[PDB]
């Protein structure tokens, strides 16, 4: 019956759970204990981007590491300029509620999500000097949480119906639907080679999908509460998850198990966005206790806290070549740390 | 000022862009945003049709109705097939929360289970929002709709079927008064937020007048904290 069939699935979890224990010969602390500590890392707010008048919900650096897109709830999506504070574009959105944004690797498009589960894709470098929607990608059933571009003709979208889809831009239909989740997806990240991507759902599970066939490869269950942020290692060989339990748990993809957890007694407040720095050593995490701590990726020790925001810290981002770390708080100011 | 011709002209574009945000930020402050709660058939479609001047938006349906030189907003959250707490942070800062309770649900049993009556289902729904950590300053403009059916149904169906401890008669003057007594006492804060109850009719046009008389109170209270008086 169902119970007998479910029992086979129940016992199927045992060997993989046992295989992880059999492969845990040495932990990260006792193999990297003989390492030089990174020390205190103090960072100062180099710029403050004070154009918005509402809560900053997302941001995304460009590939050129200078242009910067950021979307707030006041129905505006302003394309900043990190070096000299200028609003290159001010894109008026069709809906006031937006929960994500993205910037194309080439720089021609910006994609904004929303609570009306339509991924509207904008066009910047066009004739007539306007910024008009190139396409609206409807087809989801819940809400849209985070969307990234593979290239100018592909986009991967998270959703609230526990499904990640892969669209095409010339047409309007989907290509593959990454199903298999129980809780809905809140954030994802594409690998540097843009062939695999992991999504942090709301059931303490992160899955490693592939964009070719369209089904999960590895699932990780180490967290207790919902995973609220996620990001790949700069080498595409590991990924870290920040959850509501204030623990930044770093996984890997070749051993398929949890490497380490970064939790402190003083912090109880949740996590809003986790983004690795360049070289995979500074695991910057944005907590919702108004602070933004800086964890070492190999040692549990802390570093300089990037505090200074008057509200939650909604999203982070580390530039591709790694000078600046822009954080967008729910007060209307972005702060491009360095 | 060690700036090139294009760089200087680029800054002229920045502030011209900036001025259009400021000239539109004054229009957003005057705007009033109002979340709506309640079940799908508990009067959700009743009060929204009283005054509305304005299908791809299956997520959130919006109504841009206005009254007496004030543009109201109406985000009926019914299409979110997920946990309320997930996106409830996205609605922080909303001016008010219109909440509807169907008065004729005392004798109506839940569809999926033969228990947990609609008012009792809304009993925990009210607590999850009125006592929510984020929703502490957003006053709940609570309405008593479907009042044209409650008075003629309690003649043969006593209200004691819903509440095990009723201790009262079946007079609409006191039955309606008794019910709202618990609702106004469900808040953990008796001063930070207030509930503007109103026993609306099926055809009365004073509903929009009432929500106007309660939103203006929020704006006054919101401005009093800023000015420092309160």
């Amino acid at each position, epitope marked *: 019956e169902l119970d007998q069939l479910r029992q086979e699935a129940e016992q199927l979890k045992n060997q993989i759970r046992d295989a992880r224990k059999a492969c845990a010969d040495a932990t990260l602390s006792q193999i990297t204990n003989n390492i030089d500590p990174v020390g205190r890392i103090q960072m100062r707010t180099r710029r403050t981007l004070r154009g918005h008048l509402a809560k900053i919900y997302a941001m995304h650096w460009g590939t050129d590491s200078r*242009l910067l897109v950021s979307a707030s709830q006041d129905g505006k999506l302003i394309i900043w*300029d990190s070096y000299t504070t200028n609003k*290159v574009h001010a894109i008026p959105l069709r809906s006031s509620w937006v929960m994500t944004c993205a910037y194309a690797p080439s720089g021609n498009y910006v994609a904004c999500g929303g609570l009306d589960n339509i991924c509207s894709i904008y066009n910047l470098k066009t004739r*007539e000097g*306007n910024v008009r929607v190139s396409r609206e990608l409807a087809g989801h059933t819940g809400y849209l949480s985070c969307c990234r571009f593979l290239d100018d003709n592909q986009i991967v979208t998270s959703s609230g119906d526990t499904t990640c889809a892969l669209w095409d831009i010339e047409t309007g239909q989907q290509t593959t639907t990454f199903t298999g989740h129980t809780g809905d997806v809140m954030s994802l990240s594409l690998a540097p080679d843009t062939r695999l991507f992991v999504s942090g759902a709301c059931d303490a599970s992160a899955k490693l999908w592939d964009v070719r066939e369209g089904m999960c490869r590895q699932t990780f269950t180490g967290h207790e509460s919902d995973i609220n942020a996620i990001c790949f290692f700069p080498n595409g060989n590991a990924f870290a998850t920040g959850s509501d339990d204030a623990t930044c748990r770093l996984f890997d993809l070749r051993a398929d198990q949890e490497l380490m957890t970064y939790s402190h007694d003083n912090i109880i407040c949740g996590i809003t966005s986790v983004s690795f720095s360049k070289s995979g050593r500074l695991l910057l995490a944005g907590y919702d206790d108004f602070n933004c701590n800086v964890w070492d990726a190999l040692k549990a020790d802390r570093a300089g806290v990037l505090a200074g925001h008057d509200n939650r810290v909604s999203c982070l981002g580390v530039t591709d070549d790694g000078m600046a770390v822009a954080t967008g708080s729910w007060d209307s100011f972005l702060k491009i740390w360095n | 000022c060690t700036l*090139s011709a*294009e760089d200087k*002209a*680029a800054v002229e574009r920045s502030k*011209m862009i900036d001025r259009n945000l400021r000239e539109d930020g004054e229009k957003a402050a005057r705007e009033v945003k109002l979340l709506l709660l309640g079940a799908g058939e508990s009067g959700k479609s009743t009060i929204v049709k009283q005054m509305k001047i304005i299908v791809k938006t299956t997520g959130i349906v919006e109504t841009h109705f206005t009254f007496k030189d004030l543009h109201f907003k109406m985000f009926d959250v019914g299409g979110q097939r997920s946990e309320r707490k997930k996106w409830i942070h996205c609605f922080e800062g909303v001016t008010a929360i219109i909440f509807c309770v169907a008065l004729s649900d005392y004798d109506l049993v839940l569809a999926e289970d033969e228990e947990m009556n609609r008012m009792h289902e809304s009993m925990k729904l009210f607590d999850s929002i009125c006592n929510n950590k984020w929703f502490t300053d957003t006053s709940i403009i609570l309405f008593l709709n479907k009042k044209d059916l409650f008075e003629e149904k309690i003649k043969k169906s006593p209200l004691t079927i819903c509440y095990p401890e009723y201790a009262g008669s079946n007079t609409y003057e006191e039955a309606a008064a008794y019910i709202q007594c618990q609702f106004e006492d469900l808040n953990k804060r008796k001063d930070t937020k207030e509930i503007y109850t109103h026993f609306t009719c099926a055809t009365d046009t004073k509903n929009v007048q009432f929500v106007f008389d309660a939103v203006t109170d929020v704006i006054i209270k919101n401005n009093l904290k800023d000015c420092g008086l309160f």
Partner: single-chain antibody
Amino acid sequence: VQLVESGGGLVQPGGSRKLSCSASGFAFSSFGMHWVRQAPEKGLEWVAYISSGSGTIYYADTVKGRFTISRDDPKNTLFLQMTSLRSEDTAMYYCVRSIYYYGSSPFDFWGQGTTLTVSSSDIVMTQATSSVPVTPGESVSISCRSSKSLLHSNGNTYLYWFLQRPGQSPQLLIYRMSNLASGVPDRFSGSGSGTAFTLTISRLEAEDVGVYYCMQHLEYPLTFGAGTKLEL
């Protein structure tokens, strides 16, 4: 998208007329428009500049005071008023648009031109080559030396190359440098050094014959260069 303008005629010296530029196909409010003339036997000369919203306005030395420029955003037109004009202005005028932000391409599209006939400290840029012969299949190199260091302190160096095919209006080829315009093949390739600059064409066809003008944009007034024609 097009920039069509009307006006011109036979003018007695000392008169006063109006030149109207009607724009259709883009967002005129966001574009800082220019005015460029061309004598019947000379190169190009800058006339006036108006920014978006008529914020800042610049004028050439030879038309300062007696020329007035204005834009009509609701009417979507660009206006030039010339008063006390002399016989040295027997030239036809272009209507040139330009948008200024990060990564933009100024002087993208040029108008057609209205012929006006009259009956009787800045950067100096010169091109030594003039009417150089060329054959289809052989690479050609054009050098346009400047007089001031065009490399700004922010890493951006400004030099625009324009191609004027016989008959019609010039079109943009290479903005600041090493950047191709929007709608031009990859054959063109420009390089610079700060004071001496070079434009190299790998392969050329019958439609590539014309006159090449090099323009800087470091500081107003912005000066063109003497034409360098191509000979078969």
